[PDB]
């Protein structure tokens, strides 16, 4: 349990699509549920989506439930987040978080990538 590294953030037009990536290292990625947490420019933390360790159970926040698609590659230890229709309010910094135990919370946080829409 050492390292998480997000990638894929950038600038896209409103209503566009983007796909974020988060690499993992130092732990058996297939054995841990992974979650995305979002921090607005106003520094407010907002939870986005959680994918189970095997990907069978997936949860979304109501604000992205129809537009965002979380996915994982257990064979490569890379986590993904797919965004279909980015609204103006979606601009933020995205962190992938290891959340296997609900009674313990998000043990580790990646460096994050800024996403801008304008």
């Amino acid at each position: 349990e050492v390292q998480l590294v997000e990638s894929g953030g950038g600038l896209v037009k409103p209503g566009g699509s983007l796909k974020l990536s988060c690499a993992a290292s130092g732990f058996t990625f297939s054995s841990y549920a992974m979650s995305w947490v979002r921090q607005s420019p106003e520094k407010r933390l907002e939870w986005v989506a959680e994918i189970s360790s095997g990907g069978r159970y997936i949860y979304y926040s109501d604000t992205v439930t129809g537009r965002f698609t979380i996915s994982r590659d257990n064979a490569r230890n890379i986590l993904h987040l797919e965004m279909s229709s980015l609204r103006s309010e979606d601009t933020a910094m995205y962190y992938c978080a290891r959340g296997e135990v609900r009674q313990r919370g998000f043990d580790y946080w990646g460096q994050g990538t800024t996403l801008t829409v304008s």
Binding site: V37, K43, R44, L45, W47, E50, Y59, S61, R102, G105
Partner: peptide, 17 residues
């Protein structure tokens, strides 16, 4: 900055900080 967070039921929510 410190944030409280609940993990009891979805959607997950973080405090105002």
């Amino acid at each position: 900055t410190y944030y409280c967070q609940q993990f009891s039921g979805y959607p997950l929510t973080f405090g105002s900080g």
